[PDB]
Write a protein that binds this ligand. Structure first.
Ligand SMILES: Nc1ncnc2c1ncn2[C@@H]1O[C@H](COP(=O)(O)OP(=O)(O)OP(=O)(O)O)[C@@H](O)[C@H]1O
Ligand SMILES: Nc1ncnc2c1ncn2[C@@H]1O[C@H](COP(=O)(O)OP(=O)(O)OP(=O)(O)O)[C@@H](O)[C@H]1O
Ligand SMILES: Nc1ncnc2c1ncn2[C@@H]1O[C@H](COP(=O)(O)OP(=O)(O)OP(=O)(O)O)[C@@H](O)[C@H]1O
Ligand SMILES: Nc1ncnc2c1ncn2[C@@H]1O[C@H](COP(=O)(O)OP(=O)(O)OP(=O)(O)O)[C@@H](O)[C@H]1O
Ligand SMILES: Nc1ncnc2c1ncn2[C@@H]1O[C@H](COP(=O)(O)OP(=O)(O)OP(=O)(O)O)[C@@H](O)[C@H]1O
Ligand SMILES: Nc1ncnc2c1ncn2[C@@H]1O[C@H](COP(=O)(O)OP(=O)(O)OP(=O)(O)O)[C@@H](O)[C@H]1O
Ligand code: MOO
Ligand code: MOO
Ligand code: MOO
Ligand code: MOO
Ligand SMILES: [Mg+2]
Ligand SMILES: [Mg+2]
Ligand SMILES: [Mg+2]
Ligand SMILES: [Mg+2]
Ligand SMILES: [Mo]
Ligand SMILES: [Mo]
Ligand SMILES: [Mo]
Ligand SMILES: [Mo]
Ligand SMILES: [Mo]
Ligand SMILES: [Mo]
Ligand SMILES: [Mo]
Ligand SMILES: [Mo]
Ligand SMILES: [Mo]
Ligand SMILES: [Mo]
Ligand SMILES: [Mo]
Ligand SMILES: [Mo]
Ligand SMILES: [Mo]
Ligand SMILES: [Mo]
Lengths: 268, 245, 245, 245, 268, 245
């Protein structure tokens, strides 16, 4: 396997050719931002709850960026579900819903960003390339909207018009693309349970689990968007994610310090 | 119930990047055929990438870049092919339009003129799926996602070969390559080996809501695109597995 | 002398965000009525925000954000309503257009197609006036500023009620709410209590240069918008205090 | 062989910034003449900068700024003149379009409406050539570069004088200024002294591929633009040195 | 020569008036970024060669920006020549080719920028005004695409449709506009020779030469785009350029340290 | 004061019947040139009669018929040439229109499509003037009467020769035939000998109200019609003796 062998195949064969795909798999692997952590702040689980949830998290982010480079992505929340319901009732396709949902995640990024502006932290574009905000000790963090850019080209789910790739997937793929060292989903439960704890009285906490074990238990579409689990098994750089409760003070800080709070979901 | 059709009168045409790679010898007869089609249909013409994306893949992989970096670098070449094609059609009122324009203002632009040209690559960008080091959501995939999302009347894929064979008709096993007049996406997806269309095209066909068939035709043979847009069988028909309401 | 009329043949229609909030039951009959109006007028359709702006106000105020932060957050919801409405009209050649396009290129877009859709919120953004914690320059205000600046033939405000009452016909004092067939902006501005239109609309009416009347009509009753655009009295007429040259 | 013509049916008209500087007395008769020309031609109208660019040059040079800083500051004034002119023509379907739109989507915009307005300055910006402290690639130059690149049917330059004289007919040597009915670019380029057109216009004429003549006419005399667009000799003809295929 | 004398002429005379031009020539001369160096990284000569050429140059840039402010422009390369050949065969004019070539230089800037992002260095717009990245010791460098913005308004050459002003000219005019102290072209040969050394066996190395001497020897269109030579003779700020071999480790670093590696081409 | 111009943006083109007589070898390049002119002008194309009118004159005179009988018999052949030409342009939206349509509804037809074709013969019919046994008001005359009555922008006469000579360049004195680049109608009317244009054309030029020049060009040389419609001098210019208001 040499560069000449790969370049010949790249010229002479279709990109669909298994021989080309295999030669491509052998290429070197560059991590663009290997030292950053991607954090998702849930829209419904955090930002929609207002000051009592958001203000403590702002304080943690400000304290944490002294020792950690952070890419902070926003979820969407109840306003996106309202738009999805309106548009779905009209027969609009998933590609149109995806555009509508992005505007709500944008709103949340702007609200978070204004609480952090006096600390130097901006709302950005090309966060994974926004190299200048991340390289400063006075800054060391960016805020971005968590929706993927697929918009009208969103691939639909097998059933229904709800975009299957939303802000969990958007934040995860950014972490994966830039080769970040860590991916933390900040929600409103301690982590993954045997069942939805908002509905079940006796659900059991799961500290650590693989994607396959989650599927075997029917937890494929539980605390994370179910496509994120499949994305995680195909990932090159981010082979595990951590889910923590942002309503507990210090949870984010302790997750960044290597403490095993919440649930760790591994690719294998 | 399925989603409504946004532009039911639209016809989407995807031009393979490798057709453009052949230069004037291929492009001039294609431009002339497109010109005579303008009064007959309402056309969204989408260009693929071709050989220049292969070169930027070679450099990018040598530099170690991930699949989300290679995806917009290949899309760039599809866009340049689109500017080239549109320039040849400018005197008939045709221009290249950007992705945001295609996604939000296609209706008004097709009210102003008979056809527009755009890039067939979808804007997956740095959010391309991982797994392969080669971006999976390429020009065929992006064209179908758009055509099916719009509920368009059809998507026709215009290639430098007659259609789909049992092997690469330009590759090592060319001798055993047999032409496939018709196929299903699910049959193709179960096969192994190369294809003239993205494998991801087969996946989005499985979740499609409107487009029932996509025909792959040889754009190097004048008249095949014209016949395909009238539903005549002149290449390979791909059944998507959407079947009627 | 007053300024000239830039688009004297234009008709501006503002769709209340709360009409859109009702979903298909309200939107489908409205889309059908708009479709039959397309050959009769040259329409700039502007959407308001509705209930989602109320939710983002609740979050924003809880976070303590100033009025110049809340203004673009509410405008976002008007824009989404505009994309929804335009999508339903795409097959007739209608698209959503951005504020810069409305302000600089409306003439060419209404030459290409019969109607376009835009956001009714004006781009006051972080430069919204202080005083109230609620952005004052909202959808009714933005639609009137545009209509009067263009010298348009009219502005019709399409609501989820029959017009202006002496009290909120959906509120606590509903029992004493009396319908107002006609009113003047100066009379309304002197009143206290809620209205179906921005209070800022009354202020910009006072400095208006062209539009003499604005009619508020119930978009939940099919045919009222059509009648209003022909000048038939089917809701509340607001006299602006512009009187002729 | 020479390059093809992209928009062979196009007519380009450059309006001198100093014509606009005269305000309504000049602009109103020009707008009326343009209105009657709209059904006769497919017009790209490009505005120059005029006196405001002179003022920003005075401030900029006093601040010591280089020629690549002064170039976009002067272009700004050409753009404002273009917005002013387009606004006067809005009721006929005319709008101002941006440089990216002119360069990539002119065909579709001239399919939607009969004329558009743009800035005549080329986007050389901070990459303007050094040498003179005054940006050389100005409005006449930008209009010709575009017209010749498009292979347009003509370029007509609309001035506040009858054409080219042997001296500035408004300057100190006005007494010896003799009218030049016809000239060649190479003859002008060898002359010394002021001209009503950029000296850089003479240079790009030397490398032109399509436009054979450019006529300079007095836009303050109603009917001269109309006659020039039909090829009638009413000002100064500049031969470019392109001669036929 | 007073401000009043210049302002009177600016109002009363055509910009073509020799008297106005002469008064304008006497104006004060401000350098916007006098302390920065503009570097062009060749597309065909460096970036198209991949890891073996690009990775050592990335390392040099990272080390060099500790003592030097750098504006790093990208060339285009073989993909631009492919597009030029397609478009030229169709009869398309030089203005259309110029737009096509810019996309290729943009690609190269993005690839370079991703290798430098973890060092804080961004890909930018208005690099010569991108004052905030250049003013930090942690950054001190930007990457930009080297094509001029003329696009459809590109002036054609006397013959043929190849845009005459490409990435050498784009990078040079940026250095000149911002009054930078130094302009370095990074290519794949040690410098200027008596003839093309890729084709000639006995070409002789030229350490230093003026534009006029180059024309007198028939080297007008040799290692630099020939219009750059004329641009250099009209320049106000950048009156000489240096051409070095980027395939030799440390050449860029040593050029920045004042060592006379490569060829110095002077305006006069 | 002179009468107003009814269709000031109109361009009238008269195609000589003898050009059509040459069949495909002449008509196909002319049709292609007309096709590329369609987006540039608003064209009324009028066809002359040619050799078949000569044959019906031979039969008619042999039968002794008067000039008012021969006039509609020759007009018939101009109409057939018009149907032939229009059929070749049908795919571009061009049709033949009747004389009543040309006289009363030309405006709406040129609003629907870019060009129409009609017969150049005027409807003098059995009310043709006596004197000559050959109808005097033929195709050139009818085309000019219409063009000047409409106040059209121009009339271009498209011939099988380069223009007007001092003698028939295809006749006995061909050897002394000298090309006339420019002439006046009054000078021609005083001359004796044959011309490529009706003598009656010179008479109606004398009473014309709007058209100042008519150019006669060789339609067998591709590009001359295109150049003439832009006012380039490529054949014989006839000055009518209208001079400006
Ligand atoms: N087995 C489970 N364990 C834990 N939580 C679960 C489980 N099943 C369902 N959930 C629910 O998933 C929720 C978290 O998902 P949710 O989409 O609300 O978070 P989010 O990131 O705020 O979403 P968005 O950003 O799209 O608004 C929890 O509030 C919980 O009620
Ligand atoms: N089974 C197959 N049947 C037909 N062609 C095949 C098959 N397998 C491989 N090919 C090859 O695929 C080629 C088309 O290449 P490709 O699909 O990459 O180009 P393209 O579609 O023009 O490019 P783009 O995807 O950028 O638009 C054909 O020329 C053929 O050599
Ligand atoms: N005096 C009044 N007369 C009529 N309606 C009133 C009055 N006072 C309050 N209202 C209320 O105003 C409601 C309309 O609400 P609102 O004007 O906020 O919605 P909208 O115009 O659709 O929203 P947007 O301004 O975002 O477009 C009516 O349903 C009614 O309940
Ligand atoms: N030889 C000349 N012949 C004619 N006019 C001249 C000559 N030399 C100088 N001029 C002057 O040029 C003036 C036109 O000025 P200028 O060309 O700067 O304006 P403009 O073209 O309207 O501006 P812009 O270039 O911004 O569009 C005329 O009014 C005249 O005074
Ligand atoms: N006299 C000469 N001395 C040195 N090199 C020469 C000479 N004449 C021609 N060259 C060639 O010029 C080349 C450098 O120019 P080239 O345009 O390839 O560089 P580049 O900056 O990579 O271009 P781009 O960025 O446009 O791809 C050298 O590889 C060399 O072969
Ligand atoms: N002085 C002249 N200059 C040029 N051509 C002349 C002259 N005298 C006679 N002719 C002849 O007139 C011929 C054109 O014939 P004529 O004008 O009858 O045809 P036409 O205009 O095509 O027919 P129609 O009047 O039916 O449209 C030329 O071919 C030429 O032989
Ligand atoms: O937004 Mo546009 O400028 O419809 O074709
Ligand atoms: O600028 Mo546009 O692309 O008029 O509808
Ligand atoms: O891109 Mo458009 O063509 O007038 O919005
Ligand atoms: O009377 Mo008509 O049927 O205008 O083209
Ligand atoms: Mg293919
Ligand atoms: Mg309201
Ligand atoms: Mg001038
Ligand atoms: Mg004749
Ligand atoms: Mo940045
Ligand atoms: Mo930033
Ligand atoms: Mo655009
Ligand atoms: Mo756009
Ligand atoms: Mo846009
Ligand atoms: Mo826009
Ligand atoms: Mo724009
Ligand atoms: Mo634009
Ligand atoms: Mo745009
Ligand atoms: Mo920035
Ligand atoms: Mo910046
Ligand atoms: Mo930046
Ligand atoms: Mo008829
Ligand atoms: Mo008729």
């Amino acid at each position: 396997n040499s560069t000449a062998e790969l370049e010949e195949l790249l010229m002479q064969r279709s990109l669909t050719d298994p021989q080309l795909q295999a030669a491509a798999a052998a290429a070197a692997d560059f991590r663009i931002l290997p030292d950053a952590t991607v954090i998702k702040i849930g829209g419904q689980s955090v930002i929609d709850r207002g000051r009592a949830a958001v203000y403590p998290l702002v304080d943690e982010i400000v304290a944490a960026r002294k020792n950690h480079k952070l890419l902070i992505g926003t979820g969407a929340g109840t306003r996106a579900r309202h738009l999805y319901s309106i548009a779905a009732g009209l027969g609009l396709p998933a590609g149109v819903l995806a555009q509508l949902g992005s505007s709500v995640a944008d709103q949340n990024a702007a609200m978070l960003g204004q609480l952090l502006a006096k600390h130097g932290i901006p709302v950005v574009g090309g966060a994974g390339l926004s190299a200048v905000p991340l390289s400063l000790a006075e800054v060391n963090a960016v805020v971005f909207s968590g929706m993927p850019p697929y918009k009208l080209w969103m691939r639909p789910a097998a059933e229904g018009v709800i975009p299957p790739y939303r802000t969990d997937a958007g934040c995860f793929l950014l972490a994966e693309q830039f080769g970040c060292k860590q991916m933390i989903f900040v929600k409103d439960e301690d982590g993954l349970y045997t069942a939805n704890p908002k509905t079940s009285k006796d659900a059991t906490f799961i500290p650590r689990i693989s994607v396959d074990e989650m599927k075997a238990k029917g937890l494929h579409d539980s605390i994370l968007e179910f496509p994120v689990l499949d994305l995680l098994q195909s990932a090159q750089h981010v082979r595990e994610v951590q889910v923590v409760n942002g309503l507990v003070p210090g949870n984010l800080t302790r997750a960044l310090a290597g403490e095993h709070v919440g649930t760790i979901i591994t690719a294998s | 119930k399925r989603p409504i059709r946004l532009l039911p009168w639209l016809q989407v045409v995807k031009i393979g990047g490798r057709v453009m790679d052949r230069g004037a010898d291929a492009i001039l007869p294609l431009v002339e055929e497109l010109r005579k089609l303008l009064p007959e249909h309402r056309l969204l013409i989408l260009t693929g990438a071709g050989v220049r994306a292969r070169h930027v893949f070679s450099v990018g992989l040598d530099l170690g870049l991930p699949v989300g970096s290679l995806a917009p670098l290949a899309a760039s070449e599809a866009g340049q092919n689109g500017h080239i094609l549109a320039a040849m059609l400018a005197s008939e009122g045709v221009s290249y339009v950007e992705h945001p324009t295609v996604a939000d203002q296609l209706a008004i632009h097709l009210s102003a003129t008979r056809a527009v040209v755009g890039s067939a690559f979808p804007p997956y960008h740095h959010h391309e799926f991982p797994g392969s080091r080669i971006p999976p959501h390429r020009a065929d995939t992006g064209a179908f996602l758009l055509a099916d999302a719009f509920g368009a009347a059809g998507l026709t894929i215009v290639e430098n070969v007659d259609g789909i064979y049992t092997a690469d008709p330009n590759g090592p096993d060319r001798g055993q390559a047999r032409f496939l007049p018709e196929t299903s996406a699910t049959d193709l997806a179960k096969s192994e080996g190369p294809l003239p269309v993205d494998r991801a095209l087969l996946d989005v066909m499985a979740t499609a809501r409107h487009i029932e068939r996509v025909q792959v035709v040889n754009g190097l043979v004048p008249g095949r695109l014209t016949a395909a847009l009238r539903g005549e069988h002149v290449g390979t028909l791909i059944r998507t597995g959407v079947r009627p309401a």
